[PDB]
Amino acid sequence: STGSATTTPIDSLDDAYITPVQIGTPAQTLNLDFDTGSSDLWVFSSETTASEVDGQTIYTPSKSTTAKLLSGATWSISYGDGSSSSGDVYTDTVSVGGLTVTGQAVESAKKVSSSFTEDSTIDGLLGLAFSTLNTVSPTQQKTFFDNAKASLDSPVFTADLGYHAPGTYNFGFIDTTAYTGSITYTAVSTKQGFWEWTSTGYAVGSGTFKSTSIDGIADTGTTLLYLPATVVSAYWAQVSGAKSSSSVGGYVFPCSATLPSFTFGVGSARIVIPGDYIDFGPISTGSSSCFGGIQSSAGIGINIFGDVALKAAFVVFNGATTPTLGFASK
């Protein structure tokens, strides 16, 4: 079987992308954030504290003929930026782009933190990292990827994120139309639950490639590209008005500048991030300063290849028994 869905950015800054998922019978369509950096499928529901629900579409398990309560099971989760939800667990039918998995655990939010309630466009997350990260207790539950791999035509999914435009997630096959050249694969380490990989180094604009290990995560559900402090300083040294700003949290530069591109190594291949992609957007509407799309991971503690990075590529998540990550230029 395969599956194909359109992913759209939630805003004019590509902060995140949503893809419609059909849960339950008859189908309730929610717009989820497909997050290769977590392993929980969770939804705003008829269970969610009312005062914590603003604009989102909810999942009502009571109207799904296929839903069953997974008895005893709870979950609680916090993320990178501070936000957090918890609740209880149903299994139900979940379809993405026509690919259908039955008995999928669908974590029902009893409570959500303020940044979730504030973002009217995301109805939940669908986790696509390794199932070892799943927060359901006392028995952890598999991701929709894991649950679908018995039926996929191949055990893979691809992410084809657009620049201020829609794109695609595909499951179970590789669209040889969506990219140029060939894919290069590099090994993944599952030791901490992530899509974790070693980039072989980096170049700024038309300057030399520097061979340096940079270990990190491919995270479709982090907005930016978070690099070690010295690699980031090397990049913004090339843009004359950029500075580290304590007030805004990171490197800012005149919206006026033409930013150099940023190249990252995948084994012997190179993916170039065009410099327009690293212009994140102005700091406030009408400002003359712009927020940099490449920031220090020093705070976060681990390097994340975020949407700024992955949206310049075509990316294959190879979930075979030994997984690999594939990048191609597009």
Partner: peptide, 6 residues
């Protein structure tokens, strides 16, 4: 922005 399971 947003940083998704730290």
């Amino acid at each position: 922005x947003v940083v998704x399971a730290x």
